[PDB]
Symmetry: T
Subunit: 143 residues, 12 copies
């Protein structure tokens, strides 16, 4: 269902938001500043995903998550408790999460288009395009 897929993204966005803050704070090594800058941009864009996806559930007449307790249980992304990272561990860590979200937004688009919900479908397709490009930049950067 379109709504249930939206709430999965919502719960995963809020966990990824914090996970990316940890990368932002605890990155080590010579390119500390560029990764410090980039991670901050990532969690700001997923703060926007967090809000948009939730408000879209509201426009569709349902209830998004409103507690971190429920978002933690619902989330399929794993929290990161370690507190020191080099730049390429973070690129690898973010790349895997991008591929999970890409699968998630690809399903939302296919499912919304089958229900004739082209608005939810259009939103997913733009995020699909944004992720495919970021993914290709990371696989090139880790090459």
């Amino acid at each position: 269902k379109v709504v249930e897929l939206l709430k999965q993204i919502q719960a995963d966005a809020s966990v990824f938001y914090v996970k990316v803050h940890n990368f932002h704070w605890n990155v080590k090594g010579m390119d500390f500043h560029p990764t410090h800058k980039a991670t901050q941009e990532i969690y700001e864009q997923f703060a926007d995903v967090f809000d948009d996806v939730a408000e879209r559930v509201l426009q569709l007449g349902e209830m998004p998550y409103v507690t971190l307790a429920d978002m933690l249980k619902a989330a399929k992304i794993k929290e990161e408790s370690k507190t020191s990272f080099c730049s390429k561990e973070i690129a690898q860590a973010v790349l895997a999460d991008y591929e999970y979200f890409l699968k998630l937004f690809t399903e939302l688009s296919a499912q919304a288009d089958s229900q004739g919900d082209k608005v939810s479908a259009a939103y997913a397709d733009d995020k699909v395009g944004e992720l495919q490009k970021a993914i290709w930049m990371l696989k090139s950067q880790l090459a």
Copy 2:
């Protein structure tokens, strides 16, 4: 301790951040728009408290929270699971949490100044003043 007071603000900030999104999404009534805008300014300003205090913990040579699991357990702020709000009851809920944060930052200033950490105290004093101004506006609006 300065660090353990900062980490409390950190945990409560992240819970307050989500609670205010719920007010943002689920406010009803004639004053839907100003409340929808005010709440958004608030969670953007507490996203900044969340990051500032965490990095200040980092500059003092200790570790902040890096997982939502730890932040929920540490947060004294109560999550709000109900999902429909009148405007006045958002002003009251927000006023009460502001008074909790005000008490926390005032102790942070007193504790940091004890220890000669005037930087942490200066930061806390700014938020004390910002909270005192906002708390006084809410009291006038609810009067």
Copy 3:
């Protein structure tokens, strides 16, 4: 026909454009300024719908309406002769016309896609999303 749906939207837009000027001028009560501001943004956005929809008719090789007499006869939105309004009256009036526009744009999108006209469908899908969002906000404000 895609063109007939576009031209219906054009005629209803031009009638809605004037009606909202009336709400803009004749709102009474303590919410005068917020309503006076919001109505003006509404008619400026429908001035743009009026113009976009007309030239899309021309890019498809047909003629849009060019006279007020033809648009008044074709419009299903009805004019408002009352010259004094309460603020919740205006929100209710605007909510109803939006749902009419939402249905008009959904049919334009569905019909345009069925003919392989993905450009017209894409334009309509943008307006469906904007109308779905505003309707949720208007329903929340009257709740």
Copy 4:
């Protein structure tokens, strides 16, 4: 009467506003782009005259027209059913209507100064100068 003249300008502006969209959409020939841009600048200026005179009627304590049906009966300016124009027709059509608006605004200034309504006369004199300038520019372009 000042209000009668203002409400006459109101109706004729609404008719001219749509007529200039027709010129805007259906100009043909080599000077298409400059004419396409000039016509759009003209209907945006008359959207502003439309709102200004209507609001001026209200601050003088009376009611302007609020329906397109009422403005078409009051409008002295002919609607235009033709659907294709060369660039010199449009400059001729616009010049003819500008001279009509000039007489109308000159009468408003004279009547308003009779009644000691100097703010209404001042607004009218500003539009008289704007019309006298554009009229002189159109005569040079047609010379």
Copy 5:
């Protein structure tokens, strides 16, 4: 005399300037923020009226008031000594003072044109229109 009207407007501006600060500080109730923000706009506009009229007296060759003691003695606007207001009280008080200013500026325009001082008359006609627009909005807001 033109300068006596300017100096009277000058004195009444200075008292109204402080009075509006009192409304700005002590408004209570749910419409706190819009009134808090409108009142500040108002007292900055009368700060500029205070300076404009004073400097115009100087261009006409006499002296404006230069002490608060004389401004209180000369003013006809009355000071507000209570320290708590709801939003509708403030609106009714500003409307009453605006109508007083509108007569002062209308008389200034009338007298200045009778003497051939068209510059002073034009300045007053500008303030007359601003008051007439603001008055209409307040009457609508209290309706």
Copy 6:
């Protein structure tokens, strides 16, 4: 005739335009830079009356001057063949010419209002006001 008054201003503007350049280039003494900056502002503003005044003559259906030979003959402003100036000499010179233009714009406004030419008169009343303010400031500076 308003035209003959306008063209007189035209001729005097262009002569004063060059005279002010001489003050700009050849000011001596410690106030070099404020006077150097002020004279440039002055001649840029009179380049503007030069063009505005000619275009109005054209909108009234007559011809302005089109050669320096004709303007130099028509001009009453005297040219300055001295090539070195003290800062107060410049202030004195500008003040004398400003009172000449003020007389000219007052007579232009008086005459245009006699014939019902409110546009030309409104243009002149603004220049009367700008000169009265500038004249006052110059008198204070030389006082």
Copy 7:
């Protein structure tokens, strides 16, 4: 395949990019400035098509063209060896090339949607809409 259509657009874009520079340099006649300004915006837009289209090939895991030699052998758009043009046959030339790109992007969208590549299709639908708008405007100018 989507990729081989994307790469075809890439090759034709680079030839069209240089062809429009030739028009940009060698247009003659009284309309020199607008077409000179117009062509520069066209080749700046196809530089952007050139880069967008190639990067999408990479996000799809393939290689775009990387040499001018390969793109020349692949482009179907004809090079222009003539070295002097009037304004109308530049418009006819751009109109003909726009209709070729339009078919290409329409094919690209149809193939992308067939395979479930909604991102590539969304990009193509944008270019289809922009070409349809420009084609309509070119036909009006050549009418």
Copy 8:
């Protein structure tokens, strides 16, 4: 008491606010324009002190002055009834009043810090520093 120091600053600010207007209007001599611009920025900055200090009293739970009658009787800054000044007397008058304000803000910082009111003390320390910078600059200019 901190509020008693705040309310004294408020009363003296409003009196000083007007006195500087008198300096602004009636400065004579060669340095007219720099002093005119300087006094305007001084009185606009004390208008801001006036409002800040008053709002601080309200956040501390007390009432500031709300009438010019009370502020005149509380003020210690003497009003200036003279209407003509050279530039150097204005600098002397402003220098004397600045050291009076400096002593007031210094006492305010001392009392607020002794009572643990770090917020009002921080505000006072900022004005103390700004007054010291302005005091030093004025002493150099009068040297």
Copy 9:
């Protein structure tokens, strides 16, 4: 001599400045607005050549012209007494004068480099380049 050439450039600039105003006011035909706006930019750029050249003569330790009487007798550009122009004739008039200024500036550069005056030569070389670009564009539009 460099000063000789600079003062000749000075005199011809001031006459051309007014001539281009005549073209600006008195162009007729369907290209009125492009020619109206283009001619204005020309005279604003020569107003600056006028000032640059005069100030450079001053830096070289001699005196520029300071009266229109002196510049009129020195100028070689001829004044234009006709008061009605077609677009093509304005272009040809401007092209002929541009080739004169180009000559003049090429002689200034060559002469300045002889005596080692690289600054004057560098300014001249920039004007040579700007005129060569403009001359080629004018020849293309006249082809």
Copy 10:
């Protein structure tokens, strides 16, 4: 010949423009992002060189290349057929191409000054300096 050197730079710029696109797309390794940004700006300055030199050829009365077939025949920059690069590789490749362009522009400057074509020499001297700065920075980066 100045023109033959300009046309050579033109032909090499067009090949270098594409080569740098290949570097832009296919850079791999840790330093993916900065190189992706750097290569894109590089090709944007050479798009500007491409247009400037061609327009300078036209100002000299000769014809630039207008065909990709002729430019690749004339170009001496080797095309790059590889599709995978680390950042150091790209730096060494660009450095070699910069040193070639540097000899082209120094020879261009030397020839133009020989013939008295100081405009072409100054354009070349600016490009020589820009290349010398970038060459120094690349040698520093490869050190």
Copy 11:
């Protein structure tokens, strides 16, 4: 005395200012560009420190250093006579000097508060926080 400590900071600031220019010019290695940009911001911010401290000395009624000869003597920042550095080397040098400025600013704050000079202490505390944040970032980059 706070003044000696301000003057020590002044002398070290000017020596640090030049040393950072040296790092700015002579960094080598694949990380030239980020370091070149970062060093330029450091020396511009220490130019601001150089000026603030000197002006703070003067407001305290003392004299700062005014010659490089005296500042070289007093400075404890060591000059660097090497002309080639890798990036890690520069970060080490900058981190060591930042801990020196941090110590230096901490004593300034403590001693200024001892004398009730809260203005000097507040300025120093701002610098302590800026240095603590930058030091944390440099330690992470060298980690």
Copy 12:
């Protein structure tokens, strides 16, 4: 030698940079504020020559001065030990040093042109012109 003249300019720029801060801090008298600001603009411009000139040495393959100890021994501009200046003394201190820099940049241009180093000569000629203009202004101000 070009490099030898460049590093001489570098050393004198760094000494002049500090001397002008001394003028900036220790100016006294009524004309305090313009002089405080002009000196600030001057030392910021010589900070730019300091960096430009050092970087030009580097791209010519040499090392500039890198320590204040070396720059002090190379500088010919004398340091200033006095600590108080009137504005007329500063104006001629600056004029004398400007005449020195003018000679230095002039000889740099001549030497660089002798070596075919036209980039260094163009930069020097730009500084020669900027100095020639300022020297003309200071002489007029001291006249």
